[PDB]
């Protein structure tokens, strides 16, 4: 939302009403000096800084989580190749679950229908199993767990090597919880609330308290200052929705294609 | 808002200063802005650090709770994956894990666990659990006996027992982390004196503002007091993430989620 | 007498000295404005802010270190119960080592005498061994490990299950190193050196600069600015020795109590 | 940078010889407003430079891990299979291939020469076919370890100890990829840069009122401070970007090669 | 050094007083307000920077903490798992102690030969000295000891593994210290911040003088002290393996390490 070019423009308009209405000032007895707006301005900058910090960390964590999908699924596929080179059937099954897991997680975070993707990757019976669950993505881990478990029952994996691969499903479990946590735990609203008020009220009142000092250069300076606060406030906005579909949000489709392309590269009998 | 009170209180004090500004020279009282710029910026800097510290507590607490869901999900998965047919154990262990969550929430909210416990476990167990001064720990220990017995009975190997044992440790770390964020507050000086300071600063501020703003002073002073006081109380809220304030953690919702997860479809699983 | 008040009262005095002496300023050739004191005050506030941040983090780390003791001991005893439910002989021995470890750790950090706490807990053949070492706490860990080792040699623990319990001793190992590191490595004394000087001198010289602008108001404002600064500075100092005996420091006594009661509860004592 | 210092001096000299015309027209520039702007920018640069620094440090840590993992893997190979020098040499090849290949991948440069020197041409073709060559190298390292296991020279346990090390390299590969196909601040980084750029150009105009002829000196000093801090952030933000200092990455890949040749007695020269 | 810049600063204040007369005449005005802006900017930057420096120092301290922990726990595992193998005990301890001293040498860029000779047979010294990285070669030798115990069937794969993990931890320590030592952030950008604070401090009185007159040097020195104190403390912490006041007592830390390992293996300093 580029209300930035709206507020920038609404700012010019506030400068102009300030310039012309500057007379009726002492009649009334209303004075605005810079100094107390420097105090508030500074306080707001500090609080914006700390807040944007949190915003940024949340977005970084969203990237890291998704990064771990790629890492853990890569490594699970590696272990399967290196430990069971012969077993391409199991290879293909486990891969399709891992790929399904990624897509499913994207769908869940975007609240979209994973049915088509699941159906492209899995047999109908497995899809039914997945979609029947109140927690589909988590049920994909269970099914992948079951493949690993069969290999174990059949003696193709020992307890040790079964365990090496289980750890990978643990990591994917940490991704899934993390994303869920992030999705339902925003940076607290109070922050963005408080700050949105103060930053808007501030950019509004500002040309009024600059007009005393600047006369005609009010608009050009009040705009430059306001853009600075709003640019910085809006970087938070652009970082607060990691899973969304906006241009600034995570390109989750491409990340899913990357994951799928990677797992497919590591298979094919080679 | 206890804030709306003190915001209005700041408007009264701000009128007082508009009426007093002539009588300044009579009484002998000059008051420039610049010392209040100095003081205000210091307080802002300290409010920044304090707030950041509070948020960290919030975020750790949120995370420790996230681990409950993860760890419990992976323990159930492992039991389903390794002992697919052992539904009686599945059911027993899941109820301990669910008891674990609720018990932890009660522990931290200082409320009575009994209703939630009885809902989930047989009564002998509820008394074994309520008998301990550490009920959450006792639930963990009981959950441990379940996997221990599967091992004694040769149903788990040492390896596979260990994979599950790891998950109980993960929950032990949550229990410990949560107890540390609960019993251990951030010292009472931090809040006690910082609140004094922010308020004292806010009331005096217009006295120093008049000379410059004259009439506009009640406005531009309430705006400043909002900013400082908003920030201070939010910090105070977030410091106690298991409290029942608006910006604290939805502990009830989070246990509902955990429960719905483990018990999803009468606990039925494929293969 | 309480130091902070003394420094406040020494500041109300510094202020009067400044009101009375403002007359002589013109004469003696001393002009003092607020603006440079702003620059300095802010600078000091910034550095005070980051400094306090470090002190808090040190306090938090100590807290976490102690939290690990309770976690790792609980899970060790839990494992002992879950893996060897019959072997209460070993349970009791190991639990007493774990309880000794905490008290030993506590006393070590307080630079006090473990003898009573250890005598309350262990046999004399062991207490003297432990006190014979310049590293008692590490020695208790070595002994807890013997227990776990014996159970392994006796075939009661497999290599694997031994392994599971070994990790928990490692975790206690890290707590010991951490606490020792915090006890012996201070927040560089330079932090308290530069900041105590600077903050005191600043609060002192400040009324001399406020008087120009504030006159008889000087005391009120200057004491305020001083309380803010000194309050923040002293908070850093209290947070910095987390292992101290102040009421503002960690209640190590209560924590070791919680630990002991906890492991006893788990063994049915 | 030096271009923007010279432009700042030019803008200063303009500010001086035009101070007359403009301030008479009713267009004024005080210092207090630009002091508010500049402090806020400074605050933002501070927070920004912190995010930057920490991406730089994360890059150091990831590359640190390569050094650590690769050393410990080769150590394990020697301690567990002292006799299997052919395997030692193959595995060391892939490990060193991995480093160089990662470096090439991050710096968008050609890995071919490094691969051709280290590996058989079959392997190089396979690696070069893949859209993920670095990952492929790890996969090849994996087969080496996997074969020693299949041949019964490694047990599942000791296989596992080495498998850990490969996972560590997987974490590095991905972390680095994430640090490259960055950033996270989606080119706001150009906004703040222009904000600083503009602030520094308007600055002499806001200053000349108070400084007159001293303007260019005090304006350039301030500009230098702001522009430097901004430049530092830009450097730090982008550890793998096209203008990055390649000395340390090259030093690291050289160190690991040297260390591993040392560990497998390929150094020193025989007598 | 700090006292040099302070004296040079008292001098420059006088230059500003004596030459304030010519100010009007030469056509040079210098207000406080612009210097406040620069000043606060720089303070913010020093605040952030100093905090990065402290972070590095705390990490360095921590890494050394792990040497002690990992080494203690390795010896512990050796005693608990192989109580009879006291030859191995002694040889591995020799390597672990060699490791610490060699690490100090590496970080101080000094010769490890004396310390190595005190601890190990000459054949082993030659092997260790021949390597581009003596500390890495020491871990490999420690690794053969446990490896040989594994070959001989005296350790299982599992118990070898528990011990392997500790060597893995030492490798991590080595790496982290290597990273912190060779981690001059572009050598340019610490020299640039130094000239910055320096230049600012020398120009400050010229700007302060209009307001302060004779008081210039007092305020100007107080301010310069504050900023320089901050800046130089950062520089110390930035290089924790150096030989400055507030840099790690690495020789003391190595002594503690050696003493601990000797204590654990029944030997007497
Ligand atoms: Cl395949
Ligand atoms: Cl394949
Ligand atoms: Cl897990
Ligand atoms: Cl634990
Ligand atoms: Cl017992
Ligand atoms: Cl018992
Ligand atoms: Cl490693
Ligand atoms: Cl070789
Ligand atoms: Cl992995
Ligand atoms: Cl070799
Ligand atoms: Cl350890
Ligand atoms: Cl010994
Ligand atoms: Na261990
Ligand atoms: Zn992993
Ligand atoms: Zn295949
Ligand atoms: Zn979005
Ligand atoms: Zn986990
Ligand atoms: Zn079941
Ligand atoms: Zn008025
Ligand atoms: Zn643990
Ligand atoms: Zn017992
Ligand atoms: Zn008995
Ligand atoms: Zn005594
Ligand atoms: Zn490692
Ligand atoms: Zn070899
Ligand atoms: Zn002039
Ligand atoms: Zn070499
Ligand atoms: Zn003039
Ligand atoms: Zn360790
Ligand atoms: Zn021995």
Numbering used by the authors:
A (entry chain A): 21 to 290
B (entry chain B): 22 to 292
C (entry chain D): 21 to 289
D (entry chain E): 24 to 294
E (entry chain C): 23 to 291
Q: Could you give the paper's own sentences about this structure?
A:
Human bestrophin1 (hBest1) is a Ca2+-activated Cl− channel essential for Cl− transport in retinal pigment epithelium (RPE). Although the structure of hBest1 is still unsolved, two Best1 homolog structures, one from bacteria Klebsiella pneumoniae (KpBest) and the other from chicken (cBest1), have been previously reported. Overall, the channel is a pentameric assembly with a single ion-conducting pathway, which varies in diameter along its length and is constrained at two narrow points: a “neck” contributed by three residues (I62/I66/F70 in KpBest and I76/F80/F84 in hBest1/cBest1) on a transmembrane helix, and an “aperture” formed by a single residue (I180 in KpBest1, I205 in hBest1, and V205 in cBest1) on a cytosolic helix.
Alanine substitution mutants for each of the 12 residues were generated in KpBest and hBest1 and subjected to crystallography and patch clamp, respectively. Moreover, the equivalent KpBest mutants (W16A, G18A, S19A, L259A, P262A, G264A, and D269A) all showed an overall similar structure to that of WT KpBest. The corresponding “Ca2+-binding” sites in WT KpBest are occupied by Zn2+, an essential component in the crystallization buffer. Notably, the short extracellular domains of hBest1 represent a challenge for quantitative measurement of the surface expression by labeling techniques (e.g., biotin). They can be classified into three groups by different molecular mechanisms: (1) mutations on residues involved in Ca2+ binding, including W24A, G26A, S27A, L294A, P297A, F298A, G299A, and D304A, likely cause defects of Ca2+-dependent activation; (2) mutations at the neck/aperture, including I205A, I205T, 3A, and 4A, increase open probability by functionally mimicking a constant open state; and (3) mutations outside of the neck/aperture, including D203A, P233A, Y236A, Y236C, W287A, and W287F, alter open probability through the neck/aperture residues.
